[PDB]
Amino acid sequence: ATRFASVYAWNRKRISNCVADYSVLYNSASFSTFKCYGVSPTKLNDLCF
Amino acid sequence: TNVYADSFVIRGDEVRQIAPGQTGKIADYNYKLPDDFTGCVIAWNSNNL
């Protein structure tokens, strides 16, 4: 967005009460490493977090 | 028996994605690698041509 914090003072953000998606992650910037531990990226929109 | 070679050229940003059973821009809408399929995949860079 504009600027993020360091790792020792890790930046925390709270998100709820909205719709999330993974296919919308490939428009504003192309990512390099994307690993969802234990969860396949194709099913994330099919579960309700 | 019945060796078939499927040849093409792609960018390195999608080389790791071609695999039998995943999703993606190319793996879903350009070619379909079967899950029970048995074969080999070889990719090599070609800058000179």
UniProtKB/Swiss-Prot annotation, chain A:
Changing residue 3 to K: In strain: Mu/B.1.621. Changing residue 3 to T: In strain: Omicron/BQ.1.1, Omicron/XBB.1.5, Omicron/EG.5.1. It comes from the Viruses. Attaches the virion to the cell membrane by interacting with host receptor, initiating the infection. The major receptor is host ACE2. When S2/S2' has been cleaved, binding to the receptor triggers direct fusion at the cell membrane. When S2/S2' has not been cleaved, binding to the receptor results in internalization of the virus by endocytosis using host TFRC and GRM2 and leading to fusion of the virion membrane with the host endosomal membrane. Alternatively, may use NRP1/NRP2 and integrin as entry receptors. Binds to host ACE2. RBD also interacts with the N-linked glycan on 'Asn-90' of ACE2. Cleavage of S generates a polybasic C-terminal sequence on S1 that binds to host Neuropilin-1 (NRP1) and Neuropilin-2 (NRP2) receptors. Interacts with host integrin alpha-5/beta-1 (ITGA5:ITGB1) and with ACE2 in complex with integrin alpha-5/beta-1 (ITGA5:ITGB1). May interact via cytoplasmic c-terminus with M protein. May interact (via N-terminus) with host bilirubin and biliverdin, thereby preventing antibody binding to the SARS-CoV-2 spike NTD via an allosteric mechanism. This is Spike protein S1. It comes from Severe acute respiratory syndrome coronavirus 2 (2019-nCoV). The lineage of its organism: Viruses, Riboviria, Orthornavirae, Pisuviricota, Pisoniviricetes.
